[PDB]
Design a protein around this ligand. Structure first.
Ligand SMILES: O=C(O)C[C@H](NC(=O)c1ncnc2[nH]ccc12)c1cccc(Cl)c1
Length: 167
């Protein structure tokens, strides 16, 4: 038993809510919150900019030190950093950004990173300003992640569309 609340059950292990992931994180303090990152960990907008803003830019400061030491991530890859005031850990996961011309086939690889953590609060990878089809991303999530994932969908209209079309 965990302390996520009001989540619609999609499958054995995937639950979904129309909620601001930043607000969910502040309320639950999960072990792992997933950031929809880019390879440079430049947290400008979307999930990343919003999470980072909620940490008072501490996420960005930590991320810049990480990149200075390790170089960029791979598209499809991830790293574990602090969750600051939002969670124990933040799993920064790089899905493909369609508006950058990146390979949508890498979405499955991106979701595979979730399997290294027993429970996660997460956004829908490559949705929003990443420009991929959110219905497809949800299908990849359910068909790839085996651990317990709680998806927080910001856009109300998107949430309703995702629920009503889910097979
Ligand atoms: O679920 C959605 O609607 C799509 C979701 N977006 C957000 O979670 C979001 N976007 C902008 N500002 C925000 N502030 C608090 C949350 C938040 C998303 C998912 C993957 C990549 C990106 Cl880039 C965006």
């Amino acid at each position: 038993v965990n302390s996520f609340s009001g989540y619609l059950k999609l499958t054995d292990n995937v639950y979904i809510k129309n909620a601001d992931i930043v607000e969910e994180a502040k309320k639950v303090k999960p072990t792992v919150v997933v950031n929809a990152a880019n390879v440079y960990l430049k947290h400008g907008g979307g999930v990343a900019g919003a999470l980072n803003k909620a940490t008072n830019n501490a996420m960005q400061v930590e991320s810049d030190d990480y990149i200075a030491t390790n170089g960029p991530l791979k598209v499809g890859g991830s790293c574990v950093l602090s969750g600051h005031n939002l969670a124990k850990h933040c799993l920064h996961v790089v899905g493909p950004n369609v508006n950058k011309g990146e390979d949508i086939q890498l979405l499955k690889s991106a979701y595979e990173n979730f399997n290294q953590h027993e429970v996660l609060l997460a956004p829908l990878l490559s949705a929003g300003i990443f420009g991929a089809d959110p219905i497809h991303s949800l299908r990849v999530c359910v068909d790839t992640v085996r651990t317990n994932v709680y998806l927080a969908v910001f856009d109300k209209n998107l949430y309703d569309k995702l629920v009503s079309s889910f097979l």
